[PDB]
Amino acid sequence: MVLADLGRKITSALRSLSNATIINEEVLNAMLKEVCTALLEADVNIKLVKQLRENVKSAIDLEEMASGLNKRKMIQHAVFKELVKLVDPGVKAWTPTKGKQNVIMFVGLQGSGKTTCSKLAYYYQRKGWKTCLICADTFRQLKQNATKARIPFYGSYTEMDPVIIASEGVEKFKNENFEIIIVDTSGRHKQEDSLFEEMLQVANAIQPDNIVYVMDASIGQACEAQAKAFKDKVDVASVIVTKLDGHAKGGGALSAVAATKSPIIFIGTGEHIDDFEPFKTQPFISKLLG
């Protein structure tokens, strides 16, 4: 698992608990301490780790124990359930509607992520959608990737102001009956000011059905502030997290974004076009502990 270091620590704590000769509050707190320590070592914010501990203690009532559960297993399911909550935004993410024209705009900062536009388009194409690409990269890798996947991609040759390109591109592909019309914004900004400035300029022109913020997860729990500013500036907000691997801070990023109620729809897991997967929270946590 991509969060193997956090998961190894959690499954060890649970194994120690399930092997205790007698289950009591002393044994239970030890495991919670071990779990909480693992979450902090994963850069989960202290507020969210304390909340998880409260919920697990509130959920486990050992004294009058409804029969049928083997409570060691009940304690495990209680932890499992609370890990899913920690990474779950609590909100259903937007999805394109089949037989409709869907304009999807991508947004993100410098270093936040390799050209991930092509992966979403390839994903939907592979699922049988008629899909297309619109380029906000500056005109003056991505072209060659488009040729390789055989997906028509807007090049930018005639005009340097990107809002007109985006506007014209959506029209051309709406006229050709495309179902998924994917608008790429700039990866070329280090500050939120200039990013969100162009974001509103292009959005007003093309009226996207969904705006996707692409975030570099390697900054860990500091993703929370970055996600809030984006969610506060758009109505239909989605997040795609990249660079989840290669560092210890992946868990903090996922739980930070979920704390803002912004759904993470996919994760980017490498340089290649199929290194890409939908973010389903329950299967994610299950494979980590199993």
UniProtKB/Swiss-Prot annotation:
GTP binds at residues 108-114, 184-188, 242-245. It catalyses: GTP + H2O = GDP + phosphate + H(+). Keywords: Cytoplasm, Disease variant, Endoplasmic reticulum, GTP-binding, Hydrolase, Nucleotide-binding, Nucleus, Ribonucleoprotein, RNA-binding, Signal recognition particle. It is found in: Nucleus speckle; Cytoplasm; Endoplasmic reticulum. Its main location: nucleus. Changing A217D: In SCN8; decreased granulocyte proliferation; induced autophagy. It comes from the Eukaryota. One of its GO terms (molecular function) is RNA binding. One of its GO terms (cellular component) is nuclear speck. Its EC number is 3.6.5.4. Residues 1-289 are annotated as: NG domain. GO terms for biological process: exocrine pancreas development; granulocyte differentiation; neutrophil chemotaxis; protein targeting to ER; SRP-dependent cotranslational protein targeting to membrane; SRP-dependent cotranslational protein targeting to membrane, signal sequence recognition; SRP-dependent cotranslational protein targeting to membrane, translocation. It is linked to Neutropenia, severe congenital 8, autosomal dominant: A form of severe congenital neutropenia, a disorder of hematopoiesis characterized by maturation arrest of granulopoiesis at the level of promyelocytes with peripheral blood absolute neutrophil counts below 0.5 x 10(9)/l and early onset of severe bacterial infections. Belongs to the GTP-binding SRP family. SRP54 subfamily. Component of a signal recognition particle (SRP) complex that consists of a 7SL RNA molecule of 300 nucleotides and six protein subunits: SRP72, SRP68, SRP54, SRP19, SRP14 and SRP9. Interacts with RNPS1. Interacts with the SRP receptor subunit SRPRA. Component of the signal recognition particle (SRP) complex, a ribonucleoprotein complex that mediates the cotranslational targeting of secretory and membrane proteins to the endoplasmic reticulum (ER). As part of the SRP complex, associates with the SRP receptor (SR) component SRPRA to target secretory proteins to the endoplasmic reticulum membrane. Binds to the signal sequence of presecretory proteins when they emerge from the ribosomes. Displays basal GTPase activity, and stimulates reciprocal GTPase activation of the SR subunit SRPRA. The NG domain, also named G domain, is a special guanosine triphosphatase (GTPase) domain, which binds GTP and forms a guanosine 5'-triphosphate (GTP)-dependent complex with a homologous NG domain in the SRP receptor subunit SRPRA. The two NG domains undergo cooperative rearrangements upon their assembly, which culminate in the reciprocal activation of the GTPase activity of one another. SRP receptor compaction upon binding with cargo-loaded SRP and GTPase rearrangement drive SRP-mediated cotranslational protein translocation into the ER. This is Signal recognition particle subunit SRP54. The lineage of its organism: Eukaryota, Metazoa, Chordata, Craniata, Vertebrata. The chain holds residues 1 to 296 of 504 of the full protein.
